[PDB]
Design a protein around this ligand. Structure first.
Ligand SMILES: [Mg+2]
Length: 292
């Protein structure tokens, strides 16, 4: 499925199994901070399913780290630390459910959250080793999943398939291509050049995940004596380092995310950049003619 986070869906707390578990009084003999934790997942999930991922995480962290700043309307929690940790666990699984299983957003999150929630500890809870999660969906969970992998993936490579970036490069408008088109000999020429590309121009998800990447344009150009020309080839992309680059932050919460990035390693001691492969090719088949 190609749910690349372009559409907005309608969701409420009651769409999420974890919230429902928290809100079922039959489950809870007494008042409980664990019950409160389950309830809290509902409103965060509502945000997540539409890609509003910075605010829920920032609200948790701001509590944990005593920033004394805005909680973005979220309730203060008994253990905002435990909820931040579990969301970091759940978010990449939700993203992977979309990619691997073609789950819709809500199903993907409920599937991801269909597990026990013991208190996280310093003895292997949660279990971060999940080598099967190796490719991003390119949708509403992808930026959060990429951040989670920064915190806990221990340097392992992730793949963002090029077609899931949702980019729409205009080769004819690239100055390098225009240059090649004018400077190439008559007849058939091999074309191969590199160009930086701001993915945010095309795709909020890509922009908030990989940001600027380097494309490679490769193919065969033919310039005919009639003035006609054609180019057939493809666009590929080089691996791109995920290092939580502030250039990629969405404006509204950029200050908060920058602060988070500077502090998160205090608590997530394995935080480290990792390569994002951007495998595959986008076909190019274009043509035109000289203006003279
Ligand atoms: Mg980049």
């Amino acid at each position: 499925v190609m749910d690349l986070g372009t559409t907005t869906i309608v969701a409420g707390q009651g769409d999420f199994s974890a919230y429902n578990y928290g809100n079922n009084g039959a489950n809870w003999p007494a008042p409980s901070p664990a019950q409160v934790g389950y309830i809290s997942k509902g409103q965060r999930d509502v945000a997540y399913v539409n890609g509003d991922w910075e605010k829920p995480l920032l609200a948790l962290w701001a509590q944990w780290a005593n920033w004394g700043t805005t909680l973005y309307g979220y309730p203060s929690l008994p253990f905002p630390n435990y909820e931040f940790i579990w969301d970091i666990f759940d978010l990449p699984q939700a993203d992977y459910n979309q990619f691997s299983l073609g789950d819709d957003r809500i199903t993907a999150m409920n599937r991801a959250q269909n597990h026990q929630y013991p208190f996280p500890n310093n003895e292997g809870i949660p279990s971060w080793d999940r080598p099967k999660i190796d490719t991003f969906n390119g949708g509403v969970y992808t930026p959060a999943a990429a951040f989670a992998h920064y915190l806990t993936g221990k340097g392992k490579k992730m793949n963002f398939p090029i077609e899931r970036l949702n980019i729409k490069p205009n080769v004819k408008a690239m100055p390098q291509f225009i240059g090649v088109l004018t400077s190439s000999p008559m007849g058939q020429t091999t074309v191969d050049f590199n160009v930086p590309y701001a993915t945010a121009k095309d795709s909020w998800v890509a922009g908030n995940t990989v940001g600027e990447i380097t494309l490679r344009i490769v193919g065969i150009l033919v310039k005919s004596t009639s003035g006609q020309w054609s180019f057939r080839g493809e666009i590929r992309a080089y691996d791109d380092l995920y290092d939580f680059n502030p250039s990629n932050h969405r404006t509204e919460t950029a200050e908060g995310m920058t602060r988070l990035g500077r502090e998160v390693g205090q608590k997530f001691k394995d935080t480290t950049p990792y390569p994002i492969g951007i495998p595959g090719a986008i076909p190019v088949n274009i043509s035109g003619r000289s203006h003279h």
